[PDB]
């Protein structure tokens, strides 16, 4: 009985928590009660097995236990039309089908939060049904949120409310708590989503090279074996998560945060403190902690690398226990280089013993491996440093703008939505590493640009409309920001005039935060663009500033809604003109 194993191993709370969550990710347009419903169902049912691993159905498997209680619900398609053939066939094709139907950008209302005084009576109320539907707005709404993770923030989420509710000035309490969690939720998904990416599209070569590098770079200390080790239990952790499989995802990870500890002087000496702590935040403190310092006297690379004469012969043997035996020690020593920096340098390594190995003799035309690593190590470096000064220029939201306007020239067949959401995340770079030495900038940033791209990459593939975009995302994870980089203002665009029905603010622009008025304003810079793209100067870094004044104005000219739409007649005229 799997159901019971895991049931057993994870206790009933966590259990049922991440039931609810599968189901969710699962069936994104149904309705909490309908969940609620069928988790209580699939509970019931797994204690029997507990108390009876021979009982009726005890000995199924976890995906078709869970599809059949999905599946009395789904096929009635004038709620979920597409979802509904997925239950005609059966496992591993129906799963292959529910996975392949996850929306990453579901059209679900934006969720809005009550009042303090709202939220602290409900919590006090019902904390569990406070708390699960908590877990299934976040759930439906990031389809590939690290389940585990998932829980991590519920408890902090729920000590919030808990704290804050009790205080003498609640809404200040609980606000900015709120924001954090919110903000840092959204970081966890952005990022999970890209392991997943590298598993499913690129494959688990792919994404163990990714696991070697960054673990290394992490545990300078440890051991090739060690790192090996660890890969495999982390990759294995991820499959399961990106592929539906949650409560054993879950199962795992726990057992893989134990395995670590336990053998903690062989991996980090930065790990004591996450050790101690209980479960949940055990884990997540040793996904993140910081790097390990690095081996006091360790030799140099070209040794065994580019000078050793029985290279190619070691090469050949094993190459893939090779490959990433460099890919180790290059990545323990540089801390310093972005990880998808360190991965292009293996790549290119690799297609330079393919050539070499082969020639007439290998010692001399290998031996220039290093000088090639350099350029690819430069215009890294040389971007951050460039759009790191820019940001201190102009400051996040006109940094924001500035990459609006840099990336809606680039891919403007793009949706607005979308390249106003990855451009203000793009323009937040500026912000988590230009405030790092020359040092850590490189690995916060570029990889940082690395989980936004995949952001784009992923909304676009939905609707496939730019091909140049299509291009940079499929042809190689690792080498995605060069491409997008190396981009250039499309001279193929065919512009859309001008509509009077969409440069049209209005009042009730100003009930709403500061954020949001940002973006309805970049929204239409990025819509200035989409018609006007030939000649785009300072000149409209000028365009823009208007519309801020003809907001900050008009919300405030004690007006029946006249000068907000009457002055937009007019300056809708004026900016035509430009």
């Given at each position: 009985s799997e159901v019971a194993h895991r049931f057993k191993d994870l206790g009933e709370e966590n259990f049922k928590a991440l039931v609810l969550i599968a189901f969710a990710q699962y069936?994104?347009?149904?309705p909490f009660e309908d969940h609620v419903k069928l988790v209580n169902e699939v509970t019931e049912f797994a204690k029997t097995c507990v108390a009876?691993?021979?009982?009726?159905?005890?000995?199924?498997?976890l995906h078709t236990l869970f599809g059949d209680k999905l599946c009395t619900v789904a096929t009635?398609?004038?709620?979920?039309?597409?979802?509904?053939?997925?239950?005609?066939?059966?496992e591993p094709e129906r799963n292959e089908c529910f996975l392949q139907h996850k929306?990453?950008?579901?059209?679900?209302?934006r969720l809005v939060r009550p009042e303090v005084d709202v939220m602290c009576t409900a919590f006090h109320d019902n904390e569990e049904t406070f708390l699960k539907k908590y877990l299934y707005e976040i759930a439906r709404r990031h389809p590939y949120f690290y389940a585990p993770e998932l829980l991590f923030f519920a408890k902090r989420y729920k000590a919030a409310f808990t704290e804050c509710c009790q205080a003498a000035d609640k809404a200040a309490c609980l606000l900015p708590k709120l924001d954090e969690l919110r903000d840092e939720g959204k970081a966890s998904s952005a990022k999970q989503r890209l392991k997943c990416a590298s598993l499913q599209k690129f494959g688990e070569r792919a994404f163990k090279a990714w696991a070697v590098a960054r673990l290394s770079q992490r545990?300078?200390?440890?051991?090739f074996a060690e790192v090996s080790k660890l890969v495999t239990d982390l990759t294995k952790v991820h499959t399961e998560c990106c592929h539906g499989d949650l409560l054993e995802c879950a199962d795992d990870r726990a057992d893989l945060a134990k395995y670590i500890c336990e053998n903690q002087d062989s991996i980090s000496s930065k790990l004591k403190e996450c050790c101690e702590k209980p479960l949940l935040e055990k884990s997540h403190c040793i996904a993140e902690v910081e790097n390990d310092e690095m081996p006091a006297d360790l030799p140099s690379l070209?040794?065994?690398?580019?000078?050793?004469?029985?290279v190619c012969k070691n090469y050949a043997e094993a190459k893939d226990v090779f490959l990433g035996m460099f890919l180790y020690e290059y990545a323990r020593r540089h801390p310093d280089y972005s990880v998808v920096l360190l991965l292009r340098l293996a790549k290119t390594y690799e297609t330079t013993l393919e050539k070499c190995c082969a020639?007439?003799?290998?010692?001399?035309?290998?031996?220039?491996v290093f000088d090639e690593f350099k350029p690819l190590v430069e215009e890294p470096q040389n971007l951050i440093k460039q759009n790191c000064e820019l940001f201190e220029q102009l400051g996040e939201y006109k940094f924001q703008n500035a990459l609006l306007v840099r990336y809606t020239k680039k891919?403007?067949?793009?949706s607005t939505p979308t390249l106003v959401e990855v451009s203000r995340n793009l323009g937040k770079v500026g912000s988590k590493?230009?405030?790092?030495p020359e040092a850590k900038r490189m690995p916060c940033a570029e990889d940082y640009l690395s989980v936004v791209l995949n952001q784009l990459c992923v909304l676009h593939e939905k609707?496939?409309?730019?091909d140049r975009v299509t291009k940079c995302c499929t042809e190689s994870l690792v080498n995605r920001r060069p491409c997008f980089s190396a981009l250039e203002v499309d001279e193929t665009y065919v512009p859309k005039e001008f509509?009077?029905?969409?440069?049209?603010?209005?009042?009730?622009?100003?009930?709403?935060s500061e954020k949001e008025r940002q973006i309805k304003k970049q929204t239409a810079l990025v819509e200035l663009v989409k018609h006007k793209p030939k000649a785009t100067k300072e000149q409209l870094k000028a365009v823009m500033d208007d519309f801020a004044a003809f907001v900050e104005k008009c919300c405030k000219a004690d007006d029946k809604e006249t000068c907000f739409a009457e002055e937009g007649k007019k300056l809708v005229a004026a900016s035509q003109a430009a």
């Open positions: 069936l994104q347009q149904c009876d691993e021979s009982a009726e159905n005890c000995d199924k498997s009635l398609r004038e709620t979920y039309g597409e979802m509904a053939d997925c239950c005609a066939k059966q929306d990453d950008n579901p059209n679900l209302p545990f300078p200390k440890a051991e070209a040794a065994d690398f580019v000078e050793s004469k029985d020639a007439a003799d290998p010692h001399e035309c290998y031996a220039k891919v403007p067949q793009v590493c230009c405030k790092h609707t496939p409309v730019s509509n009077a029905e969409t440069f049209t603010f209005h009042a009730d622009i100003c009930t709403l």
